[PDB]
Write a protein that binds this ligand. Structure first.
Ligand SMILES: O=C(NN1C(=O)N[C@H](C2CCCCC2)C1=O)c1c[nH]c2c(F)c(F)c(F)c(F)c12
Length: 128
């Protein structure tokens, strides 16, 4: 009955409403209808990160990257996920790649990506 795009929009709305497991199930329904849309996996990965399901978030970022290798969001959310998992070198490389892709695509996220990079590099530094 609902379309894949309607389910993705319901998932986005539920995510803004802090209903992360419900949002993730909507994105799963969207994938069921159309499994070749990267943004359904990137957005579900952010749900999984909020739900502390890091392995599932990593897997969704990987599926998104197979579909859209230039995705700024897939690299950024993968970097944030890796940072929480203490995989610092990979996290920094993915955040740096999100920054380079955002600049190439003329996307403006304010200071979000350099801010995330400093947080990851400071955490890596403190750990070493
Ligand atoms: O996701 C970001 N914001 N955002 C939220 O917090 N809530 C919505 C949310 C709606 C449904 C789930 C997916 C997103 C949203 O779009 C970003 C903020 N700064 C970024 C950033 F620097 C990136 F490089 C990037 F790739 C980014 F995606 C972001």
């Amino acid at each position: 009955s609902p379309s894949a795009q309607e389910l993705k929009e319901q998932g986005n709305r539920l995510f803004v409403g802090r209903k992360y497991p419900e949002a993730a199930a909507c994105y799963g329904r969207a994938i069921t209808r159309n499994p070749l849309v990267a943004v359904y996996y990137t957005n579900r990965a952010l749900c999984y990160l909020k739900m502390q399901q890091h392995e599932q978030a990593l897997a969704d970022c990987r599926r998104a990257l197979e579909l859209d290798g230039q995705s700024v969001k897939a690299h950024f959310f993968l970097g944030q996920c890796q940072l929480e998992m203490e995989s610092y070198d990979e996290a920094i490389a993915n955040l740096q790649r999100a920054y380079s892709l955002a600049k190439e695509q003329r996307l403006n996220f304010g200071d979000d990506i350099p801010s995330a990079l400093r947080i990851a590099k400071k955490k890596r530094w403190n750990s070493i």
